[model samples]
Target: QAETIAVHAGPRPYEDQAVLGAIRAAIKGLQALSFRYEGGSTPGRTREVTPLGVLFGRSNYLVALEGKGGKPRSWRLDRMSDLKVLDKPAPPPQDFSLQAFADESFGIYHDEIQDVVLRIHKSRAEDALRWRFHATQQVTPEADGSVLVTFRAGGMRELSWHLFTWGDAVEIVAPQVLKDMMVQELREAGRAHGAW
Candidate 1:
């Protein structure tokens, strides 16, 4: 007979001092761990992470030190699987402010300094609510049933990628630089991919 192993995939147990159970287990076992995860919406990219700590994202994300870059990065739980602890221990710089660092970041890429605004159509209002688009977002309901959603962001690249994800449903509200950038991006995208 085969035994079943039940797992609680999301949020870490609140009672534990170490926010993530699997990571804590790896640390306790005195070894580094390999974590596997998939990209959101963007398919086929599988991420192999080395556990460092738990990052406090919109949800609990694993903060791992992976890749040749040697920087601490985050991975969402919903897209992760096949976790295994390795014999190698985590490298130095273990004393990281994972929570404070994540708090300062805007979106997933962690732009702590830049700021931008977004104006979304009412038809896409649900997307903003679901993604929590920004930390300082103001949603105004227009008479036409459309919405004027605005927020500050950290970097143009990440924000641009986000708006592109919305297709034509979202628009740039302020910062003329972003508007120009968006136009340039659209032109480039049009050249790269067939127009509508």
Candidate 2:
């Protein structure tokens, strides 16, 4: 048997273990959670929320409800401060599915959902088959040995960045917005290095 080694990249944001512990406690007990969050339009604002679950990946995100019967939202774990567990009982929706919510995004950043289609060249069909593009992705092999991947999701910016890493093996088949994002990213990168 071989040992499993884990490798991570990018700036790993600081996640307070105490905050994580408190959040977990509140989620398990169905108790209200309070914290001072700094990010987006609301900076350093004290918020009372109902903790649902935590999604872990390149960063950690806490799925929470701002108030009783409010729409569910996610906050970065690193942006939370002065965590507190309240006595009030906060129950999650009976029909709510964290997996479904997380799957709606191509990455952690959520925005407008779109139908994404990508054609992996025949030369790299094996690589496409080995990759997990998205949770809702459907991979179909073409007649010529290429692969057609389709999924519905958001986070075009992050998706564009990932597509860049696929080199010439991938081609955007639908959604002009994603193509625009990739072009913008390439133009910015090229201009930055005098390669434009």
Candidate 3:
């Protein structure tokens, strides 16, 4: 197993191999990087950071730590411009685990991590048992012919959007925020569909 692994999580992969190649080199060489980012508060802003790893989720991301003692954040690869690997050494922290950081969220969007609980109905219990909801998810069978899925994660908005596809087969059992998010999404969808 590779100690430093690249996580590619979805179908639409980032096509720019040059950007990814530079990022990979920066990561392996423990070098910093300079790039113009287009997706944050200020678009087309020049940013500097230590490139950690690549997370290819619904979109591709470069997990990096900000310079000048800033925190770790992900940037979309497609939105990066003028990428350059720096000569300065920028090693990862001793206690930092890229996998751990990626696991903290339901998807690629990090937020306040929550202890999630979902009950898969009898009809979907088998599917839930076979599904990998999260890296740390535990699927247990219930007496009522259901599956109890428990895991600690964040990204409530993303999780809520995914749960919508499960329809009536899945029920949120904890994390009121996720429930609220689902309701909000439903409300908006209803309005758009003239359900009000």
Candidate 4:
């Protein structure tokens, strides 16, 4: 029940206690911090009006927290109902390791965003590689077998459009960013034709 409540409050456990501790810390004329409080839903309030203020894209900072076994964790205030301040003789983690908490983070972008691209086997055996490939690509023995045909040109814009002729033979292995752009472009294309 307790665990459910925490994840419910935010996306982690003991959210209630975490939030309270921060409140108490604030009331005690001190600063408490937390990271990635993953504010889910607050019944009576929303972040724009909450005391914690809107931070971390939409997450709230929860500093000076101890989880199930006194494990340090970040907690949010949206689910908390009360507090009891403690006279700790120490401060929480250095800014509570808030470096793990950065702004405008769509997802833990720690892996460094890089341009990804790839080519696969003609049998689509390479197709499966594309599905699981996360920036790591390789030359696989296809049912037809293949690489080293580096196409360098301002022609990719139209070239990509015609790539379907070869199916898996001619593939695009570029940054994930390009794929995202293509999707938006594809959506826009569909919208233009009244297909979306």
Candidate 5:
């Protein structure tokens, strides 16, 4: 099975060395022993776990298992190491949907946000349409040749940071909250740069 699936199985070799090694070793350790990963921010905590399945997302790998509390726990594959098998095989738990437990995140933080609309200047409309700003996005063209881009986001800190990169090319259209936040952030940044 390993060899047949090798074409798609395991981490892509040239991408990340540490992540690749960690994933490969963790899988071997999981298959060799009767253990499950305890979910936490701390590293290197492996307990007797009944493996359920593996969940893959855009940024992380989650190993789902029946944990110490007799409930499901998802472990980050990047943080696990020194995986060793025990004497007895761990029993598999009753099937559960991994997707139901996975957290949906936008950018780096988990704080969910609603849709934000931005009016792009006529000169910037072409560039804006060439690239996607978010997963769920809509672009509407104006009679004046400008573009309206809408996206749902979370944690304005990152989005605010990105908007400033355009240097007055983009304008926030709705969600007064974002407009105010951006103004405040820009003021602080200007102050930091010694601009009156």
Candidate 6:
């Protein structure tokens, strides 16, 4: 599980120092762990999370909790810091399903879901066909020696970094912000490679 947490998945951010121990304590003590979570949604601010259990996400594990009977309060484990298990009861709803909660997003983090399209040079269509960009990605082999790949997803930086792996074969087509991130990465890579 630890190995898969690193590689057999989408990109993951740094691991949390408090997660593993907190998870063990939660299970052993039958209690929720409180966490101070930092996420992109609310920059420069941290939110308090009290989770009943854990869910495995595409990029990392998620903390499951309920908030004012609102959303599941799903948070990535890596985004959570200062986790400590409480000695009180923290039972999840009898109907709660970790897999169902995890299925909500295609990757690690959930943001505003946007339509993402990438044009892959026809030379790479076969490779694109074999690739799993998202659970909902649509691939079309265009007659003009290009492959059109489309998917609705969030996690912009994760998506941009994933596109980086395709190298020069893909062209971003929508949600211009992600394109900007792509450019940012390319520029940094250029500097690293000593390209003016």
Q: Which candidate leads the pack in TM-score? A: 2
- Winner on lDDT between 3 and 6 is 3
Against the unseen true structure, what C-alpha lDDT does each candidate score?
0.63, 0.86, 0.84, 0.41, 0.62, 0.70
> Sorted by lDDT, highest first, which candidate order results?
2, 3, 6, 1, 5, 4
What lDDT does model 6 reach? 0.70
Full candidate order by TM-score, most accurate first: 2, 3, 6, 5, 1, 4
Q: Rate residue 39 of model 6 by lDDT.
A: 61
- What candidate 3 gets wrong by more than 4 Å, as runs, is 1-17, 37-46, 67-71, 105-112, 190-196
Query: What TM-score does each of the candidates earn?
Result: 0.48, 0.77, 0.70, 0.29, 0.56, 0.61
Q: lDDT tens string, model 5, 52-156?
A: 445554345544454454665655555454544444444444455544444224323456575789999898889989867776679999999989999776756
Better structure of 2 and 4 per lDDT: 2
Of the pair 3 and 4, which is ahead by TM-score? 3
User: What RMSD value applies to candidate 2?
Assistant: 3.9
How many clashes (backbone atoms < 3 Å, residues ≥3 apart in a chain or on different chains) does model 5 have? 3
In candidate 2, which residue ranges exceed 4 Å CA deviation?
A: 1-10, 39-45, 56-60, 105-111, 191-196
For residue 148, give model 6's deviation from the true position in Å.
Answer: 1.7
How well is each residue in 35-147 modelled by candidate 3, as lDDT tens digits? 99996798999998988788865777888888667666778889997989889989887777777767755337657988999999999889898887788899989999999
The total of clashing pairs for model 1 equals 3
- Give the per-residue lDDT digits (tens) of candidate 1, residues 56-84: 43455677766655677666655566666
| Model 6 per-residue lDDT tens digits across residues 50-110 | 4545654344565565444535645666666766676767666677666555445642464
Best by lDDT: 2
**Residue-pair clashes per candidate:** 3, 0, 0, 11, 3, 0
Query: In model 6, which residue pairs have backbone atoms overlapping below 3 Å?
Result: none
Candidate 5 collision pairs: 33-85, 35-49, 36-49
- Model 2's TM-score against the true structure: 0.77
